[PDB]
Structure 1
Amino acid sequence: SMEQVAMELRLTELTRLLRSVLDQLQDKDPARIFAQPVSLKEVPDYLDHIKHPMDFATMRKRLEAQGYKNLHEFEEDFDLIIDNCMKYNARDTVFYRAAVRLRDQGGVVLRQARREVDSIGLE
C-alpha cells in the first residue's frame, strides 16, 4: 500500500538523521573506548556484571537494518554504553572518565536531535 511506503520513507529519513547523530556522538570518543563490544575473551566475567552490553559498532548494525523506530530507542542504547561503563569501572579509571565526557558532550547533540525529530516529524 502507499501508506506503508510512506511510513517506510519516514523510517528511512529517521535512519538518515540517526546516522548523523551516531557519527557526531562517536566523535566524542576519540580514544575509541566504546567503538567495539567488550571482549568476553579478555574480560571473561563481564556478563556476570553487565546484563545488556552495548557499543557503537553494535548500534551501527541495528541502525543500518533500520532497527531504531524512534529516537528514544536509539537513546536507550547510547545510555547503555555509558551506564554499563560507569558500573563496571571505578571512578578513578580512564574508562569511567571517558564515559562521563561522552555523556556530557553527547547530551548537547541529543538535545538538538530531539528538536529535529519532532520538527520534521519522523515518528
Structure 2
Amino acid sequence: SMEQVAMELRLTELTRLLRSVLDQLQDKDPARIFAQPVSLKEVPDYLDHIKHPMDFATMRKRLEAQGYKNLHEFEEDFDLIIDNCMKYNARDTVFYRAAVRLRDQGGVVLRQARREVDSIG
C-alpha cells in the first residue's frame, strides 16, 4: 500500500536524523569509553551488576536496521549507557566522570533533536 510506503519514508527520515544525533553524541566521548560493549572477558561479573548493557556500537547496529521507531526509544538506549556506567563505577573514577560529561553535553543535543522530530514530524 501507499500508506505503508509513506510510513517507511518517515522511518527512514527518522533514521537519518538519529544517525546524525548519534554522531554528535558520540563526539562528546572523545576517549571512546562508551564505543563498544563492556567485555565479559575483562569484567566477568558485569551481568550480575548490570541487567541491560548498552554502548554506541550496539545503538549503531540497531539504527542501521531502522530499529528505532521514535526518539523516545533512542533516548532510552542513550540513557542506559550513562546510567549503567554511573551504577557500576564509583564517583571518583574516570568512567563515572566521563558519563557525567556525556550526559550534560548530550542533553543540549537531545533538547534540539526533540524539537526537530516534533517539527519535521
TM-score in terms of structure 1 length: 0.98
How many aligned residue pairs are there? 121
Q: Deviations over 1:46-103 (max 9, x none)?
A: 0000000000000000000000000000000000000000000000000000000000
CA distance in 1, matches of 2:101, 2:24: 14
CA distance in 2, matches of 1:34, 1:120: 30
CA distance in 2, matches of 1:24, 1:120: 19
Q: Which residue of 2 aligns with 1:39?
A: 39
SS in 1 for 2:38: coil
CA distance in 2, matches of 1:109, 1:119: 15
TM-score in terms of structure 2 length: 1.00
Could you tell me how far 1:13 is from its partner in structure 2? 0.1
Q: Which residue of 1 aligns with 2:67?
A: 67
CA distance in 2, matches of 1:15, 1:110: 15
- Structure 2: runs of 5 or more not aligned: none
Q: Which residue of 2 aligns with 1:87?
A: 87
Q: Which residue of 2 aligns with 1:13?
A: 13
Could you tell me how far 1:30 is from its partner in structure 2? 0.2
Q: Which stretches of structure 1, 4 residues or longer, exceed 3 Å deviation after superposition? A: none
Could you tell me how far 1:118 is from its partner in structure 2? 0.1
- Compute the RMSD of aligned alpha carbons: 0.1
Question: Percent identity at matched positions?
Answer: 100
Could you tell me how far 1:18 is from its partner in structure 2? 0.1
Q: Deviations over 1:10-45 (max 9, x none)?
A: 000000000000000000000000000000000000
Could you tell me how far 1:119 is from its partner in structure 2? 0.3
